[PDB]
Symmetry: D2
Subunit: 206 residues, 4 copies
């Protein structure tokens, strides 16, 4: 039938390039595809920057269910069998049901997005997406500090690491973000929820 | 140094075999490992001797105890889906403190939904291997575990924890996983299915 | 430590795009690289595989460079294997891209050995021009007609001569069988 | 049909992985058949997992067996272990099976003790739809191991030694590239020796 492919990893891993690669191969077989992207609510963005440059044509949607409405609309080409989704982490939980129904109905769904927000925690609905994806490709970047495989995105404001309670959404590139390995990802004021965690950390440092 | 590998997929995909395979390689290089499993009520082969723990934090307590050999820097964890949320913090802390953590567990419960705390482990895992079984119906790659009782597919609202093997469970592809009374959260979902149904 | 990464698959699989992706990763981390190509996307053209080691030894080479890219590797001879292994042994990361099969479906030049020496292998798929399944083979056609087994290996070109196909849609007239029971088995089936 | 190739050094779990892939079929009631070159009745991993197998002297005998009354017509999957012991003819056999609707899952060593391609396997990489290069753990440094090292009386095996030698930990270990050393390894390119010597000196 259909299925879900999920492309993930930190910033600077080339996630979007990988999505473009997968769509370009469809073009040589003349297989039709359609790409969607979430439109962030700019009222919920702390500081808006105006920029429109993009490497990949996609239809902006305000919410995940609007993908299904678009497919039901006159704008949709009925021969389209592949649905691409970029920057998926900006959707809410509603994307999971959408992607599943698409896959259950004969579509190949190719999804790209960040696995972790700046805190190193799951970004929005992507945790559940991992579970539903038939195929996962977790890409790596290169650690800006040591050059090892980078698995994390680190936000720095004026050289200072971002605090745990800072805003999830902050749009930007190298001016705010670097790719780092686990070892070089530090988040000030990260809490511990287990009762014996800080005891263990103290124990192993002696 | 220190990272997490996650081995996942439906029942009958050989997850435990893959965990065994990964850990067994260590024995030739004299690298010690220790396996943990949650408290849970064959062909030829040796199973992993493993410490039974009632909760994820008990893993760290064990490591700090006189029972743990401090030369051990590889930690195995099987049936991870039976843990609660606290497993993620345990795994991350181990990885941050020089341990290699190799984890196996089901990605989906019988409803086709994320099993326990599993979804978060995908994000925290450096390496993910999603294994496939073989669909009991069509032979394609199987991605889901299906529960039947007396021939009938288990209803959506049945209990999640139900221990057993082939008497209740089979592996199926997406198309052959059906859950009676599965709810739709999005208001346009059933509209779309009916719309697309018409050819 | 050094190593070899190998990107492969048929035409229209996006091999070059994947090579580009991996090198672009390096730029964000301030890691310098250098790409080489055989004679007939920025690269240094070399007439043979050992010339890569000569260029590196020359003073036109940036001493900072720790990553070596090699595109269209199937056009080199077997000498590329030693060169690649030498670089890996001497601290370089070598990222190689090339076709795994020629139009006949047989190993393209030196790549068979390269597979063995590579630490990491990524075999990419294209989309079959005939059925849309995963494509693993490159098919040549000259005038609607499939290329004969004994046609020339090197023939530079794009869609005017070539397509991606799955194994089932890859057909080569006059393909010989070297095993005595192969035709006996095929007739049986 | 199609071809899957499982490879990498000794102690990587290759046979264990073949067994895993084939065991999956049993729960779905899918028949398979395992072949091995040359326990004689089965293939086994080093943790005691095992499957029955037919042993063959050569690749063409696989097709002969499949054409005989001993072959179950329901068989969809063909497994082949220790493939490095076959000759070049294994490629054609594997291709023909894949072309005739069989899934062929193949396991074997990629490199001999010299670090060179083991027998016919270089071509199998090309013909295999799916490649799984497994790693062992370096006996020296604990890094991912990619090579098999042979030792004779505690000393590394010479380049000109016999390729075929049956044995486990008595002779063989798994090592990373850096810890794989073979005395009297020849340089085939006329500028390779001058490169190493130049580059080593560049650390001045
Ligand atoms: C890691 C991270 C990235 N981003 C943004 C930066 C980029 O604009 C975009 C990734 O392409 O997501 C966030 O908004 N929050 C985060 O926590
Ligand atoms: C799929 C599934 C498995 N299981 C059990 C059955 C097996 O005993 C165990 C997996 O080894 O998990 C559940 O309890 N609930 C479920 O939804
Ligand atoms: C498949 C095939 C491609 N090619 C060429 C076509 C393209 O120019 C190049 C692939 O990028 O290789 C051959 O020369 N011979 C072949 O058999
Ligand atoms: C590396 C190597 C292994 N072997 C053997 C040892 C093992 O019995 C078998 C691999 O399982 O192959 C050789 O015969 N020659 C070699 O060069
Ligand atoms: Zn780092
Ligand atoms: Zn099915
Ligand atoms: Zn086809
Ligand atoms: Zn080593």
């Amino acid at each position: 039938i259909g299925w879900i492919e999920f492309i993930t990893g930190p910033m600077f891993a080339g996630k979007t390039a990988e999505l473009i690669r997968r769509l370009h191969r469809l073009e040589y077989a003349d297989v039709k595809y359609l790409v969607f992207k979430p439109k962030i609510d700019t009222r919920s963005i702390r500081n808006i920057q105006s920029r429109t440059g993009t490497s990949l044509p996609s239809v902006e949607v305000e919410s995940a269910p609007e993908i299904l409405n678009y497919i039901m609309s006159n704008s949709f080409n009925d021969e389209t069998k592949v649905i691409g989704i970029d920057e998926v982490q900006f959707f809410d939980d509603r994307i999971c049901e959408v992607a599943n129904i698409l896959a259950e109905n004969g579509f190949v769904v190719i999804i790209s997005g960040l696995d972790k927000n700046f805190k190193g925690e799951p970004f929005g609905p992507i945790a559940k997406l991992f579970t539903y994806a038939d195929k996962i490709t977790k890409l790596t970047a290169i650690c800006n500090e040591c050059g090892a495989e980078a698995t994390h995105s680190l936000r720095k404001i004026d050289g200072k690491h971002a605090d745990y309670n800072d805003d999830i959404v902050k749009i930007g590139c190298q001016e705010f973000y670097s790719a780092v390995c686990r070892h070089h990802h530090k988040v000030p004021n990260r809490p511990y929820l287990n009762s014996n965690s800080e005891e263990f950390i103290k124990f192993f440092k002696n």
